[PDB]
Amino acid sequence: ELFKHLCISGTPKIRLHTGLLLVQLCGGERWWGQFLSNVLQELYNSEQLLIFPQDRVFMLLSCIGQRSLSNSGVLESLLNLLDNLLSPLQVLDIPMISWVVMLVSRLLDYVATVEDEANQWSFINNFTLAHERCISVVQKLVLFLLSMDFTCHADLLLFVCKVLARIANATRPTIHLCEIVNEPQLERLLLLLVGTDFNRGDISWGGAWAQYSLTCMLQDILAGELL
Amino acid sequence: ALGLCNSSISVGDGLFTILTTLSKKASTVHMMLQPILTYMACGTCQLSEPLLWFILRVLDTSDALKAFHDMGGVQLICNNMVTSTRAIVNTARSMVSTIMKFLDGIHNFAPLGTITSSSPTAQPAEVLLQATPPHRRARSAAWSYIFLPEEAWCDLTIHLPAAVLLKEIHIQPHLASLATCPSSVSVEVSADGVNMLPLSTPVVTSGLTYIKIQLVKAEVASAVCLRLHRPRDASTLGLSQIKLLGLTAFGEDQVSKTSIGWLRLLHHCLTHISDLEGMMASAAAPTANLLQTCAALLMSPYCGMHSPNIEVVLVKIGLQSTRIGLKLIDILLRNSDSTIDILYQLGTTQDPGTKDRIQALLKWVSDSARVAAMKTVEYGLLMPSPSHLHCVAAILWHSYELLVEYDLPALLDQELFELLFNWSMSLPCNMVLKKAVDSLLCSMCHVHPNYF
Amino acid sequence: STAHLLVSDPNLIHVLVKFLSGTSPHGTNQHSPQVGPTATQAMQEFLTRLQVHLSSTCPQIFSEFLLKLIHILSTERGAFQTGQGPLDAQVKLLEFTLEQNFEVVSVSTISAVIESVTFLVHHYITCSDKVMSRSEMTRDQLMFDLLKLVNILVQLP
Amino acid sequence: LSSVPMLNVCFNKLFSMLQVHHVQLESLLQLWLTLSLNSLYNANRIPVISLNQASITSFLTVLAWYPNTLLRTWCLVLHSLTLMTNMQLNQESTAHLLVSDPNLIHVLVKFLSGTSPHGTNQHSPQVGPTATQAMQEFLTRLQVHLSSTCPQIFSEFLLKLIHILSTERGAFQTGQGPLDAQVKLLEFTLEQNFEVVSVSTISAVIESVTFLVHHYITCSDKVMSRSEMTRDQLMFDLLKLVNILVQLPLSGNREYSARVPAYVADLVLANQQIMSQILS
């Protein structure tokens, strides 16, 4: 209630200050990640009729998630929210999916930076996870990748590829493609990457950025497999 | 060859002229339309702007459209458009690029990266990486390289901090003394930054004051290796500034090769001659997933240049028959200004299928009022667009004003009025949903004064 | 006539193909295979004198010989396809062939030359280079002149 | 629980299904090169995606069928063929399979012929040091993989490539083609041993190269521009190659016979055309 009453209508200074209060106070709570997923689902829904500055409060959400990344519940609850969100790819909410995949992408880049201080995905910025739910959300992300048509766009494709590679490399052990895709799905991905049914002319599938992101995701999952 | 040539003395102009004269000098239009449709079927298919113009020009006459429909042309157009909409994902900048662009027009990337060479030079080449060094006198050179007699190539490897969409290389030699300009330059790109891979054959730049290596295909590259050859009669290399032009991930011909070309083909088929627009639309109707793909492409931002064609062909397909119009009404209300125009032109145009269309509109608004009364396919009933409700009100008003064949007040029911009244008082006055349902109530009371 | 004797044997076809093919095995400096304005003027004068001497008697054999030379230059492993040869001499031969009339020429050699040049121009467009150096007359003009030649050719009833 | 066999199955499906022009060759080669190198390029790296014999033959025939092969595609081809020599098959060697079919001969001839129909700027047909290094690495890996089993077929393939490049209407004669790649192929052929190679292909290549070098000397240019490496070095390297070749003694039925005491100098002495050409 304090988050929904202060960060929505308050000034940016008191918004940032009360977010800092919430992470320095209830950052280590066991329900913090569930609260973050709940406020994400109840603020950025496609049916949400509230007029609020989504971008700045999303930046605040990214800041407080990067603060609470020491807690292990935020990433688990956000990936569970993803798993619930693209469940119809076993309707689809493309904007909310985009919001949450960029949020978890920022959190996973902070995780990668922490692991570095204690590179293939640097063209965007200029902990231990359970195996089964990670496998489920990864294969659902791949099925979202394969079901991308003219309604879906290329930046979302880049970000789902990036977060797919990051979740595949973050889980212990690293998820391999055998439990990710079967033969038709991998054949569709390969023919989408190199076949001339989608790579004809200067408007090859998703553009060169999407081709590079797909290649980098496959290379990252392969390198995680052969470690 | 015409399918892969860009739009605006050129080879595409030549092919367009030979195809124009080949259409003019052809005797029967059937034997000219046959290779066109076999190309469309055998292609998915490659369809460019000059090819689109050539097909529109050969489909200028009424006999051309009749022969095109007779041997199965419209169905191939619809199937190709559906398959292309299913095939290529949208490359347009969505909301993600907008809300990540500020969190961190071709821009330079040389100052951001670093430079190195495989041989120990007398000076480092980082002076080449400046955005604009002072080029007014050019005393000796900005950077110089001394060549050993055994070697002939020297490589300048430029490592960028992140991979960029490289588009064109700029190499400026010593302008005061271009005797030291490289004879030939071979570019190399690396997306991962480690695997050097040659670009093209080395272009000869001897005697060139400025080297511009454009790429027809923009390449995602993080490292660029410029291998410069020894000059023709100089043992030294002199360079001034190297630029690395391109874009980042979030920093005419791009829409013609998509599904928009087949949609333009359908729009020209259904709108060039109105005498043939009905029966040919009867061929365009029963193709699978046409209306869903058309609405999905209409919801895309890339529709913003050709949106009148899309909405007009949707109107013609809707008023072709009753079932198709009812289905597209269902997918537009349950599953923007263009949709408002679609609903308006469906509801107020008079045909034998008008009564079923307004019945579907009233059933939709009654279902939305019911869902709002108790509180996948029901999402359009969870909240309706207020603009759609205002459009339904305008449809009912203009149907009451115009002379219609049906008994319009027979469709209006008192229970529907009670449902919309409870929906109106179920929510406060801040939102426009109240204004929409109240405009609908106003149209209801205008048709029925006894209801007021 | 001596022009009919010169055109009739295929040795003139082979000689013109050797000239426009621009082999030059001697060249350690195969830089630019163009033969220069004087050589292009000599070839144009030879072709113009052939046209003048065969205009009164039989332009059929001269136009058929010209189309055969274009077809053999533009076939597989030819000078037009591979890109070797004097670009100026070839484009001057094309611009001389544009002004000619092919109004009795056989349908077989016309079909052969249109098939060969259309395969070559589709192969030239689809398999183009991936870079371009920005700084006249190039092989772009050669392709445009070939396409103008076939625009003239397909209009022949 | 390794996904390597399913990747092998899918990549073999792509390499079998590109024959109907359904897969781009350059994109497949780049992706297969990147996915198999993640275990920086090296000629000693074993690719993690093992291909199929039918896949390799399909790649070779669609490569020899494909004209206007770009240098992107050519260096991708050379790196991919180096990796295809580096891999192992499950019992003949993959290098023997690559060398045995004439499609590799046609592919190397298309590479060293330097056609480039795309070029409006046919300035200098050299392919650059990286492409020459890729070709040298491919040839060196072929030599390494066929040194233990049968250098006969590799040296015979090299001599056949030299003969076809140097025959009438060839790349060595006409002067077209990458001069650096051709001179590097010659300098690689100099270090090879031709001590079992057949007398027939040796006689063919010596006749062809002697006709070419006599034709190059007698019909030279009439001017010279004075201002490195040129086709003069190519002719010198061909002459060094045949100096090595004529020194090879032959033993047996004078057919498919060198075996490290008549020599092939007697065979080239009996040929009046070759002797007349070198004397002229």
From Swiss-Prot, chain A:
Q: List the disulfide bonds.
A: none
Where does tissue-level expression of this protein occur? Answer: Expressed in brain cancer cells.
Regarding how it is modified after translation, the entry says: Ubiquitinated; mediated by RNF41 E3 ligase and leads to proteasomal degradation, impairing inhibition of apoptosis. Deubiquitinated by USP8/UBPY. Autoubiquitinated; mediated by E1 ubiquitin activating enzyme UBA6. Proteolytically cleaved. Acts as substrate for CASP3, CASP6, CASP7, CASP9 and HTRA2.
Q: Where in the cell is it found?
A: Golgi apparatus, trans-Golgi network membrane; Endosome; Cytoplasm, Cytoskeleton, Spindle pole; Cytoplasm, Cytoskeleton, Microtubule organizing center, Centrosome
Source organism, top-level taxon: Eukaryota
Entry note about domains: The BIR domain is essential for its anti-apoptotic function and is important for binding to DIABLO/SMAC and caspases.
Outline the subunit composition: Homodimer; antiparallel. Interacts with RNF41. Interacts with DIABLO/SMAC, likely with higher affinity to SMAC dimer than SMAC monomer; this interaction blocks the substrate-binding site and inhibits the caspase inhibition activity of BIRC6. Interacts with KIF23/MKLP1, USP8/UBPY, BIRC5/survivin, MAP2K1/MEK1, RAB8A/RAB8, RAB11A/RAB11, PLK1, EXOC3/SEC6 and EXOC4/SEC8.
Role played: Anti-apoptotic protein known as inhibitor of apoptosis (IAP) which can regulate cell death by controlling caspases and by acting as an E3 ubiquitin-protein ligase. Unlike most IAPs, does not contain a RING domain and it is not a RING-type E3 ligase. Instead acts as a dual E2/E3 enzyme that combines ubiquitin conjugating (E2) and ubiquitin ligase (E3) activities in a single polypeptide. Ubiquitination is mediated by a non-canonical E1 ubiquitin activating enzyme UBA6.
Regarding protein family, the annotation reads:
Belongs to the BIRC6 family.
Kindly provide the name given to this protein in its UniProt entry.
Answer: Dual E2 ubiquitin-conjugating enzyme/E3 ubiquitin-protein ligase BIRC6
Q: Which gene encodes it?
A: BIRC6
